[PDB]
From a paper:
Protein tyrosine phosphatases (PTPs) play a critical role in regulating cellular functions by selectively dephosphorylating their substrates. The ∼280 residue PTP catalytic domain consists of an α/β structure, and biochemical and structural studies have led to a detailed understanding of the catalytic mechanism (Barford et al., 1994; Zhang, 2002). Key features of the domain include the PTP signature motif, the mobile Trp-Pro-Asp “WPD” loop that in the closed conformation positions the conserved and catalytically important aspartate residue, and the phosphotyrosine recognition loop. Here we report the crystal structures of 22 PTP domains, including two tandem-domain RPTP structures and a detailed structural comparison of this protein family.
Also within this category are RPTPγ and RPTPβ, which have the secondary pocket with a basic residue albeit with bulky residues in the gateway region. The basic pocket is also found in the phosphatases RPTPγ and RPTPβ; however, the topology of the region differs in these phosphatases in that the gateway region is inaccessible. PTPs with particularly high enzymatic activity against generic substrates were RPTPσ and PTP subgroups R5, R3, NT1, NT2, NT3, NT4, and NT5. CD45 and members of subgroups R3 and R5 were extremely promiscuous and dephosphorylated most phosphopeptides with reasonable activity. All members of the R3 subgroup as well as RPTPγ were highly active, and it will be interesting to establish how this activity is regulated in vivo.
Numbering used by the authors: 1687 to 1967
The structure:
Amino acid sequence: QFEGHFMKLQADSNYLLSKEYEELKDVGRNQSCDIALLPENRGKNRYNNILPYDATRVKLSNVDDDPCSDYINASYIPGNNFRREYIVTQGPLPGTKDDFWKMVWEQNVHNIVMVTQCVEKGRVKCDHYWPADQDSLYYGDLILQMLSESVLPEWTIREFKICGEEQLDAHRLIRHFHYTVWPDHGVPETTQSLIQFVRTVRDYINRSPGAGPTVVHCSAGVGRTGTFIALDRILQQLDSKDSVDIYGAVHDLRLHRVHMVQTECQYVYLHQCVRDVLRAR
Ligand SMILES: [Cl-]
Ligand SMILES: [Cl-]
Ligand SMILES: [Cl-]
Ligand code: NA
């Protein structure tokens, strides 16, 4: 079973756990990121070393006169159910926030997951890319209105109405799930916190059939974002199988985007979450 597997991984000061994590290090990394490296796109990446692969990047519709107008730092990611179950992205920049909302619109996104604060330890990690109040705003040609904001202990849930300017009756409801307690150092203090957050989000995702991919982001869109997605996938497997494959999930993530589950600590945390679920049952 899982508990015995994890016991063996943790034996000898996590020796086999480390070895397994290190086996994933080169996965996916021979893939080109030439589009992301075009000079015209340079300002559109938050981090030089976190770029989407050409094979898996999300494309925006082209705006005439600008061939590089298709670019956003964003990647498609598989889950248990669909090949493009998620779109992962960086925390938007002031200059990419209209692109972000354009992607949300064009990809039929109904659910957005944000696993960061805008500022952490005095560093800007993500722009405040959504409305501050209930007054509506255009991001490019898209109209956005916050209908509700619910500040809970460990997350904030917001509802937005989005529509194109030239068709006001064809609007969409979008939910935004903002995990607000990820600590400045390490991983969350409890497994309970991220497990409950993931299950909360999943229960909303299951009630949005016909939606496009779920957007997940943090600052770079790799570590916390990858941990969120891996956890979502493995908790579904547990509920269904119950046959958990944490290694396989992280491997598949790495094929789609660099650094997904970016630290060994996050990889350990995934194993702890699953153990804790099983212990509670
Ligand atoms: Cl290049
Ligand atoms: Cl699939
Ligand atoms: Cl798909
Ligand atoms: Na692609």
